[PDB]
Amino acid sequence: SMEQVAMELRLTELTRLLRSVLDQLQDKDPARIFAQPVSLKEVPDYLDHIKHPMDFATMRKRLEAQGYKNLHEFEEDFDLIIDNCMKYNARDTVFYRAAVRLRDQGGVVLRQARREVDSIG
């Protein structure tokens, strides 16, 4: 149908906007602490601690499959990255501190993304 196509064009455009959001958020992680999944070879007990692991490469796979239907879903995954880190790692670690900085800096980017998604529909 013509409606299914119109809906698919909306999803594609959302995907385009979320790709730019993802790039901006990942720039706020210059140390690449959150770039890839925590290694189960190197942290073999990780899944005993963290039930829903997340990282930027995993988000990028979902994004490119047009697997985010709305900004809320994308934010859920970003928040997992931060929240998993802040639970697994102690306050006095480079990892925890990197998550706090990513949260604080990403807030700005996500504030305007929400306005852009509401604005452009």
Swiss-Prot record:
Range covered out of full length: 555 to 674 of 1058
Function: Scaffold subunit of various histone acetyltransferase (HAT) complexes, such as the MOZ/MORF and HBO1 complexes, that acts as a regulator of hematopoiesis. Plays a key role in HBO1 complex by directing KAT7/HBO1 specificity towards histone H3 'Lys-14' acetylation (H3K14ac), thereby promoting erythroid differentiation.
Sites of the Glycyl lysine isopeptide (Lys-Gly) (interchain with G-Cter in SUMO2) crosslink: 41
Protein name: Bromodomain-containing protein 1
This protein's encoding gene: BRD1
Organism listed in the record: Homo sapiens
Record's subcellular location: Nucleus; Chromosome
Entry comment describing in which tissues the protein is expressed: Highly expressed in testis.
Bromo domain boundaries: 9-113
Subunit structure: Component of some HBO1 complex composed of KAT7/HBO1, MEAF6, ING4 and BRD1/BRPF2. Component of the MOZ/MORF complex composed at least of ING5, KAT6A, KAT6B, MEAF6 and one of BRPF1, BRD1/BRPF2 and BRPF3. Interacts (via PHD-type zinc finger domain) with unmodified histone H3. Interacts (via PWWP domain) with dimethylated and trimethylated 'Lys-79' on histone H3.
